[PDB]
Amino acid sequence: SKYSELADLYRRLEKTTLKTLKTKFVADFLKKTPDELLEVVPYLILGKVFPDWDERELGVGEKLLIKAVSMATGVPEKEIENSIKDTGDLGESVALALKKRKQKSFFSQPLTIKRVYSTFVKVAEASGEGSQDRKMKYLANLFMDAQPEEGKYIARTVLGTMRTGVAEGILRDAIAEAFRVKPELVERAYMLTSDFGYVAKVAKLEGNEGLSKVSIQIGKPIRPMLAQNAASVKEALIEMGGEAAFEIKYDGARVQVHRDGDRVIIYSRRLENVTRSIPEIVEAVKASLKPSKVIVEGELVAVGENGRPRPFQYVLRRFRRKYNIDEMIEKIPLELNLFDILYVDGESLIDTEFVERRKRLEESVEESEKIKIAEQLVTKKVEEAEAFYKRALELGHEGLMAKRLDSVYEPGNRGKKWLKIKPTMENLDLVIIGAEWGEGRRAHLLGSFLVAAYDPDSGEFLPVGKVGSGFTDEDLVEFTKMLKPLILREEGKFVEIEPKVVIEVTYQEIQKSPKYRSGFALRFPRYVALREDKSPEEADTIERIAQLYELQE
Numbered sequence: 001s002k003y004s005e006l007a008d009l010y011r012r013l014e015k016t017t018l019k020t021l022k023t024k025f026v027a028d029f030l031k032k033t034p035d036e037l038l039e040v041v042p043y044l045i046l047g048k049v050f051p052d053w054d055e056r057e058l059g060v061g062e063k064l065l066i067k068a069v070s071m072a073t074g075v076p077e078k079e080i081e082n083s084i085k086d087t088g089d090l091g092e093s094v095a096l097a098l099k100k101r102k103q104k105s106f107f108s109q110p111l112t113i114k115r116v117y118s119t120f121v122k123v124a125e126a127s128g129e130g131s132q133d134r135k136m137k138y139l140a141n142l143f144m145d146a147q148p149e150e151g152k153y154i155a156r157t158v159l160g161t162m163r164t165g166v167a168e169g170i171l172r173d174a175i176a177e178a179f180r181v182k183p184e185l186v187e188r189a190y191m192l193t194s195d196f197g198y199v200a201k202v203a204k205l206e207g208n209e210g211l212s213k214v215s216i217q218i219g220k221p222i223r224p225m226l227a228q229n230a231a232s233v234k235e236a237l238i239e240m241g242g243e244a245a246f247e248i249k250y251d252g253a254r255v256q257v258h259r260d261g262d263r264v265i266i267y268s269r270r271l272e273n274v275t276r277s278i279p280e281i282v283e284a285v286k287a288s289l290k291p292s293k294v295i296v297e298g299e300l301v302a303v304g305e306n307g308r309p310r311p312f313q314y315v316l317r318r319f320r321r322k323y324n325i326d327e328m329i330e331k332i333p334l335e336l337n338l339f340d341i342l343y344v345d346g347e348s349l350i351d352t353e354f355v356e357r358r359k360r361l362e363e364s365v366e367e368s369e370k371i372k373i374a375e376q377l378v379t380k381k382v383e384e385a386e387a388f389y390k391r392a393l394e395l396g397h398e399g400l401m402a403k404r405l406d407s408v409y410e411p412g413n414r415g416k417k418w419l420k421i422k423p424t425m426e427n428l429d430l431v432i433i434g435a436e437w438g439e440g441r442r443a444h445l446l447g448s449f450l451v452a453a454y455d456p457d458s459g460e461f462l463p464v465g466k467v468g469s470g471f472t473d474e475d476l477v478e479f480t481k482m483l484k485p486l487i488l489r490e491e492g493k494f495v496e497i498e499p500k501v502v503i504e505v506t507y508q509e510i511q512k513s514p515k516y517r518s519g520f521a522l523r524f525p526r527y528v529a530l531r532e533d534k535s536p537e538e539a540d541t542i543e544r545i546a547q548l549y550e551l552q553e
């Protein structure tokens with residue numbers, strides 16, 4: 001049926017600030033959809049054409065879209081750039097220009113969604129030397145048959161500029177409402193597939209039952225399973241109840257590999273299709289993989305000349321090459337460490353407990369130069385895992401993964417079933433404005449230290465946290481000796497100190513708290529090293545702290 005109804009929806013939607021109603025509307029319109037468009041419609045509703053993991057994209061920029069418009073309109077891109085200069089919105093100018101051709105032009109036909117989809121397919125798929133004109137052809141070709149309403153919408157769709165107000169979750173809720181299926185089941189099904197169209201049609205026809213009967217389509221990418229942080233290895237081992245599987249958390253890029261026959265696709269963490277970027281790896285994988293139908297999860301890493309992993313954004317640039325190429329393979333070598341296998345030969349393993357999953361992984365993989373199986377420690381002993389922690393860290397990766405041996409794969413979910421153990425990275429250098437005496441046998445020494453950061457605006461030294469941890473007894477002695485001259489005042493066990501001494505400190509977290517005049521408060525800070533090479537003015541600054549806190553989410 002007609003793209004009229006689509007424009008109507010986009011209208012209703014724009015009018016309301018109310019998400020529940022946006023749901024109602026999308027929902028209601030879904031119920032009106034014939035099965036042919038059921039796979040097309042949702043993406044249209046999101047103001048897109050294809051899934052984020054589709055390699056197809058229509059190539060059309062604004063100035064390019066300016067042309068396709070003009071030859072429908074008669075209006076030059078001179079007066080169009082003028083026409084859009086008053087309004088502020090592209091599609092807004094495109095909108096009204098059609099009205100001046102609405103006293104004018106020609107010919108033919110309603111615009112129905114079927115047609116528009118078709119045209120978009122043709123536009124994106126078109127390639128090579130004869131490309132961008134054949135685009136603007138098809139587009140103007142569309143435009144002649146367009147109501148000025150429809151124009152604006154088809155236009156912001158093309159540019160990706162839509163502003164429906166409707167995200168993933170509204171659409172999920174909508175599908176649930178429309179077809180009276182179960183929100184948990186829709187969530188599950190989109191977590192496996194990532195195709196909204198497939199999910200829509202299956203809801204409409206095969207209902208709650210078939211949604212539950214939705215398993216992994218090969219080539220349709222799975223929401224990666226996620227992990228909460230732990231504080232520490234013991235925390236983790238005991239949270240998994242004394243025994244657990246341990247792995248490295250690499251500095252690398254999580255990828256997902258789909259092998260069917262010779263057809264091999266590699267999805268990124270964000271589900272970009274990166275397959276073209278890294279062909280070597282593709283060959284490598286085909287070779288390294290025993291079964292003909294598999295899906296495997298792995299962290300792709302950039303090696304560098306000492307064999308130590310490069311920061312993973314190198315992997316990200318490798319993805320970002322659209323162009324001249326085997327240059328990049330020699331420039332940055334990569335390697336692939338596989339930690340999971342969700343699929344073999346018709347067998348969905350997502351519902352299969354972790355250990356057998358690892359079993360299948362070891363079974364299907366023939367290790368190669370480029371393709372490794374991630375090393376795994378299965379242990380009830382802390383000190384082992386802590387040693388693996390220290391070794392991962394040593395080697396220059398991010399930390400340790402802990403994963404429950406009973407664990408099924410929980411796509412998209414952030415569970416306690418996988419956990420991730422890291423240090424915080426950047427340490428702070430702070431000045432000691434204060435301290436507190438020990439008790440008992442430490443009573444003659446200062447056991448707790450008060451740290452502050454510079455504010456070069458102020459000149460005032462602002463407290464950040466109190467650090468009691470990370471000192472040897474001789475550390476406390478040495479520190480007592482040095483802080484002895486500098487003590488400016490005393491009450492209780494508290495002292496007040498001259499801002500001389502700067503120490504390097506690690507913390508678990510930065511919190512915002514009124515308790516210090518800096519406004520921030522270091523959570524579980526710890527002593528790393530001492531700086532006699534620095535000045536109190538040269539110590540890290542509150543601005544740096546606020547920056548880090550804001551980067552903490």
Ligand SMILES: [Mg+2]
Binds near residue numbers: 252253312
């Ligand atoms: Mg990462």
